[PDB]
From a paper:
CTF18-RFC, an alternative clamp loader, localizes to replication forks during the S phase and forms a complex with DNA polymerase ε (Polε). CTF18-RFC has recently emerged as a specific clamp loader for leading strand DNA synthesis. Proliferating cell nuclear antigen (PCNA) is the eukaryotic sliding clamp that functions as a hub protein and plays critical roles in many essential processes, including DNA replication, cell cycle control, nucleotide excision repair, break-induced replication, mismatch repair, and chromatin assembly. In this cryo-EM study, we reconstituted the human CTF18-RFC–DNA–PCNA complex in vitro and captured seven intermediate states in the PCNA loading cycle by CTF18-RFC, including an apo state of CTF18-RFC before it encounters a clamp, two states of CTF18-RFC bound to PCNA, and four states of CTF18-RFC and PCNA interacting with the 3′-ss/dsDNA junction.
Residue numbers in the entry:
A (entry chain D): 37 to 361
B (entry chain E): 5 to 349
C (entry chain C): 19 to 340
D (entry chain B): 34 to 349
E (entry chain A): 282 to 319, 346 to 455, 480 to 599, 624 to 863
The structure:
């Protein structure tokens, strides 16, 4: 059991790089022993969960880590009743602040809510009501992707801590450090393409590098294993699709669509990469608008559960209509 | 198609580099949760079989049938036919229309909290092979994600599916995605020549190419077509009547009856034909795919494209309701109104 | 010490405001001993619990409030075991106290199922002369029409800012914090017509920074700024597609915005922008579709591009009409 | 300690029941024939399914009602044990009755029972058919199994028509000497939504509140979205206008109404609007689509604005 | 209500005489142990005569009278047990839920040496509604059947659904009677006999019309006969059977109104479209059942004459039906029951779309119910087929893959061209081809089955009826295998099955 996204979490708050302002404010809040307000938010892979776990480890220590820290996934537990019963069951246990090592521990238990922005308004209203139920003995920490998804009352009893996305130089630095630590043979171009396919995510990059070490088995990691583990459709397929739609008939469209489907490539990856291609190139505003609206409708239909081949042939019909006119 | 399936990854005929990646994955420890996907008939079950062969000894090929009794929130005991063994457990949770979450909770609990018998032979984890996870509901996949989170230590899953857009990203992101493409026409012809030459047959290359092009890159169909062509007439000629599946040519005749006449009595006749197709238990997605392909074979003047969009839209409606005959007849009625408008002007 | 709502909770029929017809009718019924089963429904934080607690402390003393009033709330699951459990046994009993009816305060009565509301309908119709229920709920339409047909309903609406600002001025005169005009405008706009969130936001602004202005409220709450949404709409209406997409995705990854909040603030903005009717219909239909597509849980960049797409078709049509 | 008007003015004979016509005539024939079969009474809630079999039983048994009549609601326990014990016990007692008289066991809300309860109720209805006659008041007759309804008569109750509710309400008004206006009667019809007990309760609520009946006083004690404003919103959506319709929608949204309440009043007004038939059907389809969005969990103001834009887009 | 017209002797039964004769033969077969006295029809007569227990008992001790819940099987068992010299002690399995009181009502109530006060009147056990009993009770009855004290009194179980799983372990040692007592010749003969028993005078044609009217029910026929006797009509004519005129209606004459209210325009102010709109809306709401109305509209809007040659209304009606299906799905999923105010607008839309003065034929919807029944039957066929599949080839393919990719090709593999020649005259290649054929039949577990057609000749079919799945009628007909080839391959299949049994005996 080697979870590299958990193994390479900095357990010390001084080991947290790039966020020393938030580290210093967290250290002041821990030493002040009166912390009613706490919130972490940012893009995934920024290590807000690792930062609050490092704060919990530097305050509670390893002995109280399994006692006064409770982590719950909000997206896994979107039901009302489970987060009513588990939070109350954890909060009702009266554990004093006395530590066997003699360190002064202030008397609160910490609660982590991972992906708390996935809740609805009524779920967060019931959550707030539970916060007002147990605002004394235990303390809470919400982790969300966007702070504007969180309803107002939960922003009243918390202090925000914004996270910048990590710059690609320190992303490549951390990836080469981890590859040197675990003796992983991968070139600089492989690291750059690995951070390209995982757009601003160190969790996805760490899991993809772990899977590359699993699938290569000691070999040098190439571009093919990276572009196949992430499921990335190669740019030759997208260029062939746009060549068929630009100058061709529906026989060519059905040929390239059947080739993509029988190659096993997912339609979600195709709509994402076709959106990425069509939002940057030199088409007209009307053509880009019609194609992107069709891509959004296609991804909605794929989320509903509609058949992918019919959606792809309708999407390629729309792209052919816009391009071949 | 079952006698000469390759038992191990070293005996495969196509996709050698993916076999090398999968045997390197087996070659080390911490084998993660797999999500095997692709098109139907590509060889996903063959790859998963070879993975399970490499994961254990020679006793993987032993299989048995159990009829396990599940209990719903309603007091109702429902039997589920599981294909199990002493090293893994293969299940199809899609047979329960609404109780799929209960069976994927209970089988996960009885496979995880019940420890393995002899831990010297197998590893610390045993495999649960879910089959066709795409038609599971969203709350069922959420319960699957919860049970995967709770029991990572002793139960590491392999999810065989197709068309991964029905699968939610919170369970896709936790699994290593392995994509098995359908083999190329040259590789289908090569394995047809191999399966003919190892039983003393004289299949020419032209009939093999016609078999590969006719089967739409489905390998099981392209091999059962070869065996049916052997049985139908043994001396293989380049011009052979390839044995066509009955519902495919019935769908082609259905599209011919659609393009024949644009009158509502023909719509009633085609409603009878669609009802026959529905009561023959084939899914309406395949019906829409075959109908659209056979209508695009008989269309002209760019109208295909509009028809193509139309087909996708009604398939979308078919994924929101429960009575598929309303949406299928809405599609063919709108298509016949559009043809009448196209052929009139 | 304590939160301001738990300090300054109203305890008198005159201390609750904007419900003067409702409070007058409740006082008229309770002076004549003709009070029916009550169903107070409305938005959160508009004075539903505090009104009936003021009426209970008017009816009963401090000593007998804990005996002839049973309170059930969100901590109690509302299924079928409760209605055949403590509330039935509470309603079907007499008391050694003065000869008056009992009282059951059932918070969040809209979370009961149709079978639970029918069982509660049986309990309500069986015992009337000794028990007067009080069901308080957010949505009237989530309960059955039989339950609406046996208990008298009362709509606790939102508080108009014209009537809301004297209580805010009273709590800013009693508690000395810095008060400006734009801070009060931000309070009465972001609070959305309920006193509970206004007092919570005011206390959080006092405890976090110390002064109450518009930008302090916006930074403490995380609400999207008006100039922020103005910049988003300007980028959608007079920039290129790749330029607008890159600018808005950098603003989303910087400011911490989400596409649902961008959607509702842009929806509030486009009814100020004097569009022609046809492009207004097109924008509203497209934005409602984007809201539903975000509700069903898809990728976010593609829906952002569809929003920019609708506004680019809009800007082409606007310039072509000019 | 005055009784509410729901139970105070409940009718005591079959001649005062205004709901059905053929079924009340069948009950009137059954009250004098004396060979009453086991019956199942089906219909919407609140249409009078248990003030009709009660009147039939009181006209049938008469002075021996208290010994030879058992009403079993869903108010008590609805397990299998109480139906096994109490119903069989009551059917096994003897009552000195005339030739064409039988005991009556009314089972209110007979649809919530399981399959075992009704498959035992088959034998309890079959065996004791000479002594007692059953009367199951069911909300939905499709949930009743086929062998139960094969051996028993099926009686159907419709939803109260607005003319019948008008006749009953004017009878209650003339009985209680209530001054009234026609606009107040229209308002109490609109807030009544076809239910008789809801109509009587709203009328007694506004009579205890304000007294004199007028259309302004009905909506002070009910406070639905006002049908004048909702009808103006539908009229603006049908007259190719989106700005004025959204102005009315924002006026009804800054009064704090939920999306569900506004869209329910939107459909209730669009039922009785005045326009073309195909435009009505397209509007009802769009309103149902938007209500599916709202009940799915999308309850923003943008969804109501998109509904208004789609209604304005249907009418060119 | 069956007061004096109840059957009491063997001459008042309303079933076919073969079923009653074999039932009486099974009842009188127990006289060797109770009293101590010393096609499918031929199969039943062989199993009722050839071979008995050493303790003078039959092989089966329980009769499963499976059929529809009416049709008077209980009264038939009562009068036959009265005729055979026993007394009927009936019991019910629906009021008995606890297994302890079940064993009190079975193992402590009857089938012992219950020598009562009437020494010439022994007793027999009659059980009704055995399908609805819990599985513990039927397991207890199975243990009583398998008790070796010994069971001597007969058990006459009454069944309603034969294909319940709880009777999977019982019918192999039971006696099945799925006979349909719907033969009017016998129903009207016993009806004339029971009319002669009292004095009611009825024509045979009128009672035959009543028999074919109320779906050949008999207890309801006696109930309505006593009802018309209480009304006072001493004679019966065609007008007396026209009091209802439909006996197959479960209040279905209202539905034929409302579909007419959808389809037939009211003939002639009342010509306003708002009045017709409100009228058909009120009728659609007042019809009560909605799913039957929707199915009737879907099955009836194309057989009606349509003037829309451009299909300008069929698309709108199918959109409306999809809207109704979406409403049903959303109201079932979100559990919010304020969405059901809309689907009453489905018929009135049809009344706007298909308002015609003509009155075509309106049919009760049979396409949807038989369609779902066909889907259930084909699904159970697939389940039985894959249960027959050996576990090695079971896991290698999904049921949809075998249904859409393999089954027609499997039928084309398993139907080659052969000649009528003996087994020893085949060549080496032909013997290897027959070995491959019988290996496929052994692995996929199918066997050719003999069937007696109603014409009289013998025909051969598949054992799980795979050709029901993998075939369509509108295709051009392919040449099937001849009869003697089916006989030859069935003989090869059974001798290969015996060879496989010998191989499994030699290995084990
Ligand atoms: N400031 C940092 N210094 C050092 N390592 C960091 C820093 N930020 C992130 N990391 C690394 O990034 C990894 C990912 O951390 P996570 O906490 O999973 O990211 P995240 O923000 O929680 O995204 P989620 O969990 O998917 S919402 C950690 O295990 C660290 O190894
Ligand atoms: N009319 C009012 N006048 C003054 N303060 C008020 C008024 N209504 C609400 N408040 C304040 O807001 C708080 C919330 O009131 P409550 O009635 O307890 O909430 P609610 O109306 O029951 O809504 P819930 O409980 O969240 S569903 C009170 O404790 C007061 O501090
Ligand atoms: N046709 C009618 N004429 C007179 N009063 C009626 C009529 N229909 C209903 N009512 C009144 O409405 C109430 C009837 O409610 P009930 O009959 O108890 O409800 P229900 O319709 O039987 O549905 P259940 O029993 O809850 S399943 C009484 O107050 C009656 O006075
Ligand atoms: N390397 C191979 N050699 C021979 N046959 C193969 C090979 N790979 C796949 N096949 C055949 O292709 C067919 C694919 O079946 P399957 O693995 O079940 O596909 P799917 O899982 O997509 O339904 C099988 O019948 C198998 O016999
Ligand atoms: Mg996280
Ligand atoms: Mg409250
Ligand atoms: Mg009632």
């Amino acid at each position: 059991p080697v979870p590299w996204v958990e193994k390479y979490r900095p357990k010390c708050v001084d080991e947290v790089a790039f966020q020393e302002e938030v580290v210093a404010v967290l250290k002041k809040s821990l030493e002040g022993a009166d912390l009613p307000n706490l919130l972490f938010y940012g893009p995934p892979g920024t290590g807000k969960t690792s930062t609050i776990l490092a704060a919990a480890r530097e305050l509670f220590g390893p002995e109280l880590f399994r006692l006064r820290v409770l982590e719950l996934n909000a997206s896994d537990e979107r039901g009302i009743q489970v987060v009513r019963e588990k939070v109350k069951n954890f909060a009702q246990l009266t554990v004093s602040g006395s530590r066997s090592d003699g360190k002064p521990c202030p008397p609160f238990k910490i609660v982590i809510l991972d992906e708390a922005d996935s809740m609805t308004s009524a779920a967060q209203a019931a959550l707030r009501r539970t916060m007002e139920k147990e605002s004394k003995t235990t303390r809470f920490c919400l982790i969300c992707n966007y702070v504007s998804r969180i309803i107002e009352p939960l922003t009243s009893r918390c202090s925000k801590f914004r996270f910048k996305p990590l710059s690609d130089k320190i992303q490549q630095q951390r990836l080469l450090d981890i590859a040197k630590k675990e003796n992983v043979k991968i070139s600089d171009e492989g690291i750059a393409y690995l951070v390209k396919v995982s757009e601003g995510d160190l969790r996805k990059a760490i899991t993809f590098l772990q899977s590359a070490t699993r699938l290569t088995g000691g070999k040098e990691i190439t571009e093919k294993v990276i572009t196949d583990i992430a499921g990335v459709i190669p740019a030759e397929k997208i260029d062939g699709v746009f060549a068929a739609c630009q100058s061709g008939s529906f026989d060519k469209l059905e040929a390239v669509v059947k080739d993509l489907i029988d190659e096993g490539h997912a339609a979600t990856q195709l709509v994402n990469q076709l959106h990425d291609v069509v939002v940057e190139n030199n088409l007209s505003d009307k053509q880009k608008s019609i194609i992107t609206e069709k891509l959004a409708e296609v991804d909605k239909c794929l989320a509903d559960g509609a058949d992918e081949h019919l959606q792809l042939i309708s999407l390629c019909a729309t792209v052919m209509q816009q391009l071949s006119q | 198609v079952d006698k000469y399936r390759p038992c191990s990854l070293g005996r495969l005929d196509y996709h050698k580099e993916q076999a090398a990646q999968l045997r390197n994955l087996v070659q080390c420890g911490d084998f993660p949760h797999l999500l095997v996907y692709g098109p139907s008939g590509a060889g996903k079950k063959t790859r998963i079989m070879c993975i399970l062969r490499e994961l254990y000894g020679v006793g993987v090929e032993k299989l048995r049938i159990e009829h396990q009794t599940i209990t719903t929130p309603s007091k109702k005991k429902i039997e589920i036919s599981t294909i199990a063994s002493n090293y893994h457990l293969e299940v199809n949770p899609s047979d329960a229309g609404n109780s799929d979450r209960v069976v994927i909770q209970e089988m996960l609990k009885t496979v995880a909290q019940s420890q393995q018998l002899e831990t010297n032979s197998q590893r610390d984890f045993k495999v649960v092979l879910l089959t066709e996870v795409d038609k599971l509901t969203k709350d069922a996949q959420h319960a699957l994600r919860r049970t995967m989170e709770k029991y990572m230590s002793t139960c590491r899953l392999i999810l065989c599916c197709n068309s991964t857009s029905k699968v939610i990203p919170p369970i896709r992101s936790r699994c290593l995605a392995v994509r098995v493409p359908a083999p190329s026409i040259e590789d289908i012809c090569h394995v047809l020549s191999t399966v003919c030459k190892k039983e003393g047959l004289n299949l020419p290359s032209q009939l093999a190419h016609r078999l590969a092009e006719k089967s739409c890159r489905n390998l099981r169909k392209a091999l059962l077509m070869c065996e049916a062509c052997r049985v139908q007439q043994y001396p293989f000629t380049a011009d052979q009547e390839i044995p066509e599946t009955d519902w495919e040519v019935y769908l082609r005749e259905t599209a011919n009856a659609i393009v024949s006449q644009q009158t509502p009595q023909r719509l009633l006749e085609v409603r009878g034909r669609l009802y026959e197709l529905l009561t023959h238990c084939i899914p309406p997605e395949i019906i829409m795919k075959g109908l659209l392909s056979e209508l695009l074979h008989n269309c002209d003047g760019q109208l295909k494209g509009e028809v193509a969009q139309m087909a996708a839209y009604y398939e979308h409606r078919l994924q929101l309701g429960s009575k598929a005959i309303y949406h299928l007849e809405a599609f063919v009625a709108k298509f016949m109104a559009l043809y009448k408008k196209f052929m009139e002007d | 010490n304590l939160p301001w709502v738990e300090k300054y909770r109203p305890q008198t029929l005159n201390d609750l405001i904007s419900h003067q017809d409702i409070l007058s009718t409740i006082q008229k019924f309770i002076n004549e001993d003709r009070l029916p089963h009550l169903l107070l429904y409305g938005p959160p934080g508009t004075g539903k619990t505090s009104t009936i607690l003021a009426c209970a402390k008017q009816l009963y003393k401090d000593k007998e409030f804990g005996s002839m009033v049973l309170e059930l709330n969100a901590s109690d699951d509302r299924g079928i075991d409760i209605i055949r459990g403590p509330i039935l046994s509470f309603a079907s009993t007499r008391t050694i106290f003065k000869k008056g009816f009992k009282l059951v305060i059932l918070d969040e009565a809209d979370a009961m199922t149709q079978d639970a509301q029918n069982a509660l309908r049986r309990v309500i119709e069986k015992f009337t002369e000794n028990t007067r229920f009080c069901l308080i709920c957010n949505y009237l339409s989530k309960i059955i029409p039989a339950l609406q047909s046996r208990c008298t309903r009362f709509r606790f609406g939102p508080l108009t800012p014209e009537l809301m600002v004297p209580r805010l001025e009273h709590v800013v005169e009693e508690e000395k914090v810095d008060i400006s005009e734009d801070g009060m405008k931000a309070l009465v706009t972001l609070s959305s017509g309920d006193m509970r969130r206004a007092l919570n936001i005011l206390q959080s602004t006092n405890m976090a920074f110390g002064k109450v202005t518009e930008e302090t409220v916006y930074t403490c709450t995380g609400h999207p700024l008006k100039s922020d949404i103005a910049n988003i709409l300007d980028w959608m209406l007079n920039q290129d597609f790749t330029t607008a997409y890159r600018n808005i995705t950098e603003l989303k990854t910087l400011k911490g915005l989400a596409l649902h909040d961008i959607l509702t603030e842009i929806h509030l903005f486009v009814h100020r922008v004097d569009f022609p009717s046809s492009v207004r219909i097109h924008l509203l239909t497209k934005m409602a579709d984007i809201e539903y597509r975000l509700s069903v849980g898809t990728n976010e960049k593609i829906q952002l591009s569809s929003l920019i797409a609708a506004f680019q078709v809009t800007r082409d049509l606007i310039v072509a009409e000019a | 300690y005055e009784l509410p008007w729901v139970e105070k003015y409940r009718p005591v004979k079959l001649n005062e029941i205004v709901g059905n016509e053929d079924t009340v005539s069948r009950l009137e024939v059954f009250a004098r024939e004396g060979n009453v079969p086991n019956i199942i009474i089906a219909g919407p809630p609140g249409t009078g399914k248990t003030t009709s079999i009660l009147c039939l039983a009181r006209a049938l048994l008469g002075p021996a009602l208290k010994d030879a009549m058992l009403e079993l609601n869903a108010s008590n326990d609805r397990g299998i044990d109480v139906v096994r014990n109490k119903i069989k016990m009551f059917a096994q007692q003897k009552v000195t009755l005339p030739k064409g008289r039988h005991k009556i066991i009314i089972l209110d809300e007979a649809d919530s029972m399981t399959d075992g309860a009704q498959q035992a109720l088959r034998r309890t209805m079959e065996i004791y058919s000479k002594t007692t006659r059953f009367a199951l008041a069911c909300n939905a007759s499709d949930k009743i199994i086929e062998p139960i309804q094969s051996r028993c008569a099926v009686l159907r109750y419709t939803k109260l028509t607005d003319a019948q509710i008008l006749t009953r309400l004017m009878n209650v008004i003339e009985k209680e000497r209530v001054p009234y206006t026609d606009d107040g009667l229209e308002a109490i019809i609109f807030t009544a939504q076809g239910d008789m007990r809801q109509a009587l309760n709203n009328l007694q609520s506004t009579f205890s509140g304000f007294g004199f009946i007028n259309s302004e006083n009905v909506f002070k004690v009910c406070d639905e979205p006002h049908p004048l404003l909702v009808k103006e919103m539908i009229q603006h959506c049908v007259n190719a206008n989106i700005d004025e319709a959204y102005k009315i929608l924002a006026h009804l949204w800054h009064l704090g109404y939920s999306p569900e309440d506004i869209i329910g009043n939107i459909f209730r007004v669009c039922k009785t609007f005045q326009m073309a038939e195909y435009l009505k059907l397209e509007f009802i389809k769009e309103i149902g689509y938007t209500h599916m969005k709202i009940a799915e969990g999308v309850n923003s103001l943008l969804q109501m604005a998109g509904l208004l834009a789609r209604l304005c887009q249907k009418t060119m | 209500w069956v007061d004096e017209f109840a059957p009491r002797h063997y001459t008042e039964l309303l079933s076919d005489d073969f079923t009653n004769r074999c039932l009486l033969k099974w009842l009188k077969l127990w006289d060797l142990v109770v009293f101590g006295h010393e096609s499918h029809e031929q199969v039943l007569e062989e199993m009722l005569e050839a071979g008995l227990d050493p303790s003078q008992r039959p092989k089966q001790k329980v009769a499963l009278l499976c059929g529809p819940p009416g049709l008077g099987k209980t009264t038939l068992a009562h009068v036959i047990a009265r005729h055979a010299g026993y007394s009927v002690v009936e019991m019910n399995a629906s009021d008995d839920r606890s297994p302890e009181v079940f064993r009190t009502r079975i193992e402590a109530a009857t089938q012992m040496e219950s020598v009562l006060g009437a020494g010439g009147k022994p007793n027999c056990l009659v059980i009704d509604e055995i399908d609805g009993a819990p599985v513990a009770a039927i397991n207890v009855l199975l243990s009583i059947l398998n008790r070796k004290g010994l069971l001597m009194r007969p058990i006459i179980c009454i069944c309603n659904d034969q294909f319940a799983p709880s009777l999977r372990q019982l019918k192999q040692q039971a006696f099945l009677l799925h006979f349909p007592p719907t033969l009017p010749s016998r129903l009207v003969q016993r009806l004339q006999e029971v009319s002669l028993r009292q004095g009611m005078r009825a024509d045979p044609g009128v009672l035959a019309a009543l028999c074919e009217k109320t779906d050949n029910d008999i207890r309801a026929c006696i109930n309505t006969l006593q009802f018309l006797y209480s009304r006072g009509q001493r004679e019966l004519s065609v007008r007396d059977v026209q009091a209802t005129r439909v006996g197959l209606k479960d209040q279905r004459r209202g539905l034929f109104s409302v579909w007419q209210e959808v389809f037939q325009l009211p003939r002639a102010s009342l010509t306003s479209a708002s009045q017709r709109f409100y009228r058909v809306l009120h009728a659609a709401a007042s019809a009560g059942e909605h799913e039957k109305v929707v199915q009737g509209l879907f099955d009836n809007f194309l057989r009606l004459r349509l003037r829309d040659s451009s299909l300008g209304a069929v698309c709108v009606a199918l959109d409306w039906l999809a809207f109704d299906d979406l409403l049903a799905g959303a109201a079932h999923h979100s559990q919010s029951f304020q969405l059901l105010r809309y689907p009453p607008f489905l018929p009135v839309a049809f009344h706007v779309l298909f308002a015609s003065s003509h009155t075509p034929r309106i049919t009760f919807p049979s396409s949807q119910q038989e369609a779902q029944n066909r889907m259930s039957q084909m699904r159970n066929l697939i389940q039985t087929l894959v249960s027959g599949i050996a576990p090695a080839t079971r896991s290698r393919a999904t049921p949809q893959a075998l249904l859409l990719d393999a089954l027609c090709l499997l039928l084309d593999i398993l139907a080659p061209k052969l000649r009528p020649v003996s087994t020893q005259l085949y060549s080496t290649r032909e013997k290897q081809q027959l070995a491959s054929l019988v290996g496929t039949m052994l692995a996929y577990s199918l066997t050719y089955r003999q069937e007696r057609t109603p014409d009289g000749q013998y025909i051969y079919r598949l054992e799980p009826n795979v050709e029901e799945l993998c075939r369509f009628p509108e295709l051009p007909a392919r040449k099937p295998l001849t009869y003697q080839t089916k006989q030859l391959i069935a003989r090869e299949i059974e001798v290969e099955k015996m060879r496989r049994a010998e191989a499994s005996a030699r290995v084990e």
